[PDB]
RNA sequence: AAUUGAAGAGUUUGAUCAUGGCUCAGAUUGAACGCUGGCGGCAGGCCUAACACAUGCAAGUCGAACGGUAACAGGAAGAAGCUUGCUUCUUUGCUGACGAGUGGCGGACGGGUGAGUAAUGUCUGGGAAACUGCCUGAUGGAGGGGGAUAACUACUGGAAACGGUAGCUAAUACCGCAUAACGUCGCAAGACCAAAGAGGGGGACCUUCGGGCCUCUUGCCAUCGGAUGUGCCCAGAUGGGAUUAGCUAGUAGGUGGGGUAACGGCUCACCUAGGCGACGAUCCCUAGCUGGUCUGAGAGGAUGACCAGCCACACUGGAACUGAGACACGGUCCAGACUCCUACGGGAGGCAGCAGUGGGGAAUAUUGCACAAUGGGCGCAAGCCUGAUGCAGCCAUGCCGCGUGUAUGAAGAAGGCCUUCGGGUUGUAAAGUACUUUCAGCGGGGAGGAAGGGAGUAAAGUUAAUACCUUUGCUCAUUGACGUUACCCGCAGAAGAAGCACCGGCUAACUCCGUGCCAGCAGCCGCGGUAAUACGGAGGGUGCAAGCGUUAAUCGGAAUUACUGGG
């Protein structure tokens, strides 16, 4: 499953910070910010129209922490869905319960809140639940659980969870550690960012 | 064989006897019928016929010589008789 | 001892010993059985254990015979015992191969009780036994250190009484504590295979109660044992901590003479006998190595080359490993004999497939051609032998080599012939006009035509012409002609030799 | 709510444009090998010799059809030694039963296999001249008698298997007679065909005091029906080959006899001389098929293990019996091949049932547990049987989930590697610090799969009978094979858990050292003859993950047999 890796050679060869760290420092300080991903990799900016195809595939993976062989189920059940693909690609990768935790801020990086899913702190609709690509629906009540809720695990986050994005596909509390999951994500919420209609292009290469 | 089906060997067997007897008493009687019908005699041929009917419908009724086989046997040999008489 | 419940085993006992003295006799004696020694090849061919019925105690009993093939088998049966008892007979003296089943026992460090086995034959005479034995550093009886003797007669067949007194006190003296109650361990005795049961084995276990249900991990032979069965009564489930049981259902053939250990798992004796095959693969690597630095060559030095091959299944697997070895003992240099695809058990169609792919003599022991075997047989009828005795084998395969070997060596004159006046012929170039002047001339054998001892031409005599006509044969005072084809070299005075030559056909000793 | 579906690249030349093959990126598999591998869920797992097999098990069941005591469990009587009222020991079917045996039904189902089989088969759609166990609705009978015989006894042959001689004895077994339409056959009149009892309990009459007899339940029989099941027939479709072009005597048709449950050349006799054939007969080679699966944008192609339907087969070859149903996978007979045992005279066997073994092959598994559940066989039920089925074992084979830590951390540590020796990189990675403990490891707790059935009660219905039994309620005892179940709670401590291919172009990802057209790499075009981004090694990098890669296999790409869609 998970990387396993050093965090910010990831960032390096994808081109910009997956938010693996605290964001106190470590943008623009400890990264060497896109300025060589590897020994030889000063020397090269060039690159193909399949490898701009894969490292926004690959960017998507590492931000969303999945693997191609599960990135591939989420893009084939893109495909069957009703409405547009690569909407609902990002929707599929959007509506992980791991990435809600992320969003919530009960997790401060996504490896955190992947740890805090796994853990059993997690309750959603009042059932526990262990499994990171669980999917969080319209009109779910999402929390940490009452025992053992508010440990120097989430208290941590819980100050960078006051000031940075949080926004309105979730509601958020994080008074008492739940969120309520009222609207869908939609377009105009995360695109840009990635090359989304290059990106559902690329398996038919 | 291995099996404690050596019963049922020994009674397909008795029952097999049983039946070819009467079977063989049922069709000496039917050719001796049908020996009065080549001969062509019409009176001996209908007391022959009228020697025939219980025991081919007593056989239907014990089923080994069939009941519509037998239906059909007091049919055929109906019919030459009653060209003969 | 696991369990440390730990009562006392009933004795493992090891005999050896060799042609008749007793031999076999001895222990169908002791289990009052009466095969009298009436089995195949005199006296037995290979190893067998048997737990006996006895008073006041039991008892086991192993035999193999000790012959010059036996080394690692007779080994292997000395090393595992308590007991080791060793024959011999009243007769007259000590054999030198007594004293080398004496070292056997010596060697594995075992104490040692003997017994003269024929005192009522009338010849017989036990004290020069003991005198004889008294020359040897045996422990023998009063005059040495004090392996007991005992006197009984077992050629004959007269009791032994007090032979088994005598296997028992020293049981009894030695300390034999045993776990009863815990977990099972031994030792391989003899490995065969059956077609209806599989591969099988005689497995003697020291560590008392092998179980219905046990893991088992001999070498590198794995499994859960499926059922046990015996020769003194067939159906065993939970054993003794002295007594041989045939064990079947198993991956391959378990080696004979060495250990089997029950185990935690089944799973973790999968990746042991994995192991324990990277560590074949190593002895492979090993064998692989070692012909090709030991005389530069992959196989054979000189020009002269001979070989013969062999395909060789046994049917006890510790029987194919010292009789290959004894046939690759026997070889001369000039002509090698060597194994390829020693096989245990029955012959089988890929065994017949190697000796159609590379020419070699099939054989198997007491073994014998199966159905698919039997397909390669009738298709291609290969040398096909299963067998009665190992003696009769191992000079089979040295007639085998005397026949493969190089056949000449002797020139020897028949004639000599001089040289005068010349003739020339479109025949063969030149005909030289001789006459024999000693010995018979012959059509066609080989001529060497020399003057004063260097040979001016060389050849096989072409034409043979007596006056006017070509002739058969020719002898001395005659008036001859020859020549050879590209001969056109006469001298007169040159002498012809013409010599026959004579087959010996060697055989190897 | 149900039409969002189709890509190209490399490579012939000095260079170009065409034609055109070859090759690759894709998806997929009952896979193998190689290297490496922590846990869990679910699915799947001999496609080779239809080659042969050790040992165990795979359907029997009713005493409520019947003689019976061979069981052995009680009871009683009696005979006896006493414990002196009880133990003991011979009788006894009295009684809960129940082997061998007799009779009935089940054994024709399920399970396994793909040899033969190119249509007689299969699939679809139709049909007419037919039968159909058990199981249900309807209408009526269920009268009266008789003879055997196995078992069992007495003899007797046998090594064993397996028997022989003579009497005795019952039945829902067997056989006569009576009785018989709405049935069969006939135009009708008529002729003729069935029976069996068993079980529970009870007032009355009475009994050779056994039960007669009543009443209830069930079985027996005939007939008209049901639904089911199967046989039969016809049309169309359903492999390949013209270097297979001629093929058919019961062949094709008729009549009559005979035959089947029934149509019928089904089979005879006799009569006539036709039939099939380019819309591919016949012959040969080759093959179980379909609903489907896989691939494919679709059209198409390949494929038919898994799963289910159907067909066919059961050591080789053939026939019939029994029975409703078989020309019978663990029935029978005979013939054949072959295997075994033996006292040698004479006898025995068919794992393509489940396990399991030899052999084969690259290669496919545990001689497990249980009738707890579902569905069956028999039975009235209990009950018994169930290798069907429910479960477990084994295997990274496939699919899928999860982990192998998280946050901080520059002095951007040493080392490694490169280095114009200025530095750069490996690398916030490590180290260190601050935290969390899933899943493992360990100790505690605990659903559901169990509804029923059994026994006891009550009502209601029934009956001459508060009986007595069933139905329908109630109540109490219970019923878990898997099972250390799923699942939950508590504890310690980052502890136990990452590898594999590839980096010249294709194709994402680069230098140094060694070797020196050698050794070797290669899927394709190709690299190497001392400065190799293509070999070997290292460093670096990329992809992918408990798997990874190679190989074999099929479709794709291939509008490269072109209907859609070519010259």
Sequence with gaps: ARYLGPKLKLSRREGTDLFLKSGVRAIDTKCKIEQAPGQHGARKPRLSDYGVQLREKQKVRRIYGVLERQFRNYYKEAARLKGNTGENLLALLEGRLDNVVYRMGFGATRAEARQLVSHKAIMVNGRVVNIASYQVSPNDVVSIREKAKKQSRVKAALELAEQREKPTWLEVDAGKMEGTFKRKPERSDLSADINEHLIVELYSK | NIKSAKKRAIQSEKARKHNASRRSMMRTFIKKVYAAIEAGDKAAAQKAFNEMQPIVDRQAAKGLIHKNKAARHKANLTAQINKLA | ?509
């Excluded at chain 3, 070692?290 to 029987?319: R, W």
């Design chain 3, 1 to 509: 001892d696991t369990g440390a419940a730990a009562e006392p085993r009933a004795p493992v006992v090891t005999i050896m010993g060799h042609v008749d003295h007793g031999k076999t006799s001895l222990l169908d004696y002791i289990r009052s059985t009466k095969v009298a020694s009436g089995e195949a090849g005199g006296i037995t061919q290979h190893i067998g254990a048997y737990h006996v019925e006895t008073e006041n105690g039991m008892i086991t009993f192993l035999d193999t015979p000790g012959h010059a093939a036996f080394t690692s088998m007779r080994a292997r049966g000395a090393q595992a015992t308590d007991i080791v008892v060793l024959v011999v007979a009243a007769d007259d003296g000590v054999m030198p191969q007594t004293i080398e089943a004496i070292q056997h026992a010596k060697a594995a460090q075992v104490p040692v009780v003997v017994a003269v086995n024929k005192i009522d034959k009338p010849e017989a005479d036990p004290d020069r036994v003991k005198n004889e034995l008294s020359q040897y550093g045996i422990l023998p009886e009063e005059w040495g250190g004090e392996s007991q003797f005992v006197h009984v007669s077992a050629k004959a067949g007269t009791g032994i009484d007090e032979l088994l007194d005598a296997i028992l006190l020293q049981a009894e003296v030695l300390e034999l504590k045993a776990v009863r109650k815990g977990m099972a361990s031994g030792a391989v005795i003899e490995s065969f295979l059956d077609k209806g049961r599989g591969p099988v084995a005689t497995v003697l276990v020291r560590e008392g109660t092998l179980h219905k249900g046990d893991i088992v991990l001999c070498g590198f032979e794995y499994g859960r044992v499926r059922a046990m069965r015996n020769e003194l009564g067939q159906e065993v489930l939970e054993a003794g901590p002295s007594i041989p049981v045939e064990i079947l259902g198993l991956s391959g053939v378990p080696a004979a003479g060495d250990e089997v250990t029950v185990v935690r798992d089944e799973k973790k004796a999968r990746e042991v006998a994995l192991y324990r095959q990277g560590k074949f693969r190593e002895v492979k690597l090993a064998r692989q190595q070692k012909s090709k630095l030991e005389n530069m060559f992959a196989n054979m030095t000189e020009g002269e080359v001979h070989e013969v091959n062999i395909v060789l299944k046994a049917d006890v697997q510790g029987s194919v490993e010292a009789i290959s070895d004894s046939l690759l003992k026997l070889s001369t240099d000039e002509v090698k004999v060597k194994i390829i695809g020693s096989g245990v058990g029955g012959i089988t169609e890929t065994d017949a497939t190697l000796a159609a792919a590379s020419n070699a003599i099939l054989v198997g022991f007491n073994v014998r051609a199966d159905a698919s075997a039997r397909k390669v047989i009738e298709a291609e009828s290969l040398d096909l032998r299963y067998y009665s005795v190992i003696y009769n084998l191992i000079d089979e395969v040295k007639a085998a080599m005397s026949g493969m070997l190089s056949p000449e060596l002797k020139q020897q004159i028949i004639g000599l012939a001089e040289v005068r006046d010349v003739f020339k012929s479109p025949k063969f170039g030149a005909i030289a006009g001789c006459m024999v002047t000693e010995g018979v001339v012959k059509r066609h054998n080989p001529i060497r035509v020399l003057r004063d001892n260097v040979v001016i031409y060389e050849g096989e005599l072409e034409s043979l012409r007596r006056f006017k006509d070509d002739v058969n044969e020719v002898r001395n005072g005659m008036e001859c002609g020859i020549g050879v084809k590209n001969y056109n070299d006469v001298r007169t005075g040159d002498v012809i030799e013409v010599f026959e030559i004579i087959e010996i056909q060697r055989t190897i000793a």
